[PDB]
């Protein structure tokens, strides 16, 4: 028999759904893999006898509950399947939003941009799919470890009343106001007051 794929995972961020596996411990470098998804009663081939260690599942519906499986194969004999359960809008990772800061004077003006989703040939953002999308802002200076937080549902925010001539560094993340779902933080972008 053939050993099945190892460390199989669906790497999904911003609805970029990629099923990833690793080539198994096998001293014979002749090995093909085939990946499938569920279409109602029946499975659909998506990657058929590929040499690659990944398969792109971004064409899947957001609101669809899908189960994905992959096997390594050679000749007529195949491996056991390794299945994962997967629903994009519930399970994908919320990428970090983009932010620009325009500090005029004793103020910090923020502007946000939700991550764009690759499912659609149109400019859709994760904010366009989730009905409860909002931004968490976390701010501090550069000599303190202490933090402060503000939540905003709009693409703009102004941090008002702070000490002047102090460089601040801020980050933003996506989250849902009706879920316990947190998105990934951005890296702090800093602008001087």
């Amino acid at each position: 028999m053939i050993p099945p794929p190892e460390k199989v995972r669906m790497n999904s961020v911003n609805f970029k759904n990629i099923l990833q596996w690793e080539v198994p411990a096998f001293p014979k470098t002749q090995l093909t893999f085939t990946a499938q998804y569920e279409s109602y009663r029946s499975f659909q081939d998506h990657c058929k006898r590929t040499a690659s260690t990944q398969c792109d599942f971004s064409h899947l519906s957001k609101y669809g509950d899908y189960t994905v499986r992959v096997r390594a194969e050679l000749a007529d004999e195949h491996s056991e399947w390794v299945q994962v359960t997967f629903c994009p809008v519930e399970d994908t990772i919320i990428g970090p939003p983009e932010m620009q800061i325009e500090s005029l004077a004793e103020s910090l003006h923020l502007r946000f941009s939700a991550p764009q989703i690759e499912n659609e040939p149109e400019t859709w953002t994760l904010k366009n799919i989730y009905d409860s999308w909002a931004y968490r802002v976390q701010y501090w200076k550069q000599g303190t470890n202490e933090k402060f937080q503000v939540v905003s549902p709009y693409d703009s925010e102004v941090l008002r009343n702070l000490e002047p001539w102090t460089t601040y560094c801020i980050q933003v993340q996506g989250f849902l106001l009706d879920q316990q779902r947190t998105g990934e933080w951005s890296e702090p972008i800093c602008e001087r007051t």
Binding site: L104, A105, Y154, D155
Partner: protein, 201 residues
Amino acid sequence: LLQHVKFQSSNFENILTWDGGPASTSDTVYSVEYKKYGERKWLAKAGCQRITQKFCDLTMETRDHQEFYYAKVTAVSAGGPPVTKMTDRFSSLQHTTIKPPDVTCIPKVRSIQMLVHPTLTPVLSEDGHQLTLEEIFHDLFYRLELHVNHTYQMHLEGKQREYEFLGLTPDTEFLGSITILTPILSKESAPYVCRVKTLPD
């Protein structure tokens, strides 16, 4: 002799429009009929029967923003036969565009204040009074921008009706634009745009 027969709907003001053709006689007249989708009888609008103009206000006749309707225009030509073309299924809630918000810009010495006033609409509540846009779309909000030069803009957004851009230099020209957004139905008004100048202090 009849073409482009359609609804043009703004803030639930629902106007029927059509155009003549390459055969539009001197005395060519148009009659409008409307009905609610799923009805057999076509109602006749009292005003727009055998009229020479090319539009008809059906606001009172399609007042239910949650309803679906149809309208048709009958063009009769001097030489003969009549042509009747109707519109696509019309839903005011889904097809209406948003008018720019009703704003007064107030120039201040070191800031710019903006007041957005409610707009009444022809759609009524159960008790029979006219609704504001805010009353129809609970998701309505205002996005304001204050443009200085290609590289610098100030932004404010919210559900409130009072906005003030703080921290400006006196005696400076700014461009303010205020936009209504309805995200759920992906509606967006054209911007209201003020050319304002902070007072010279």
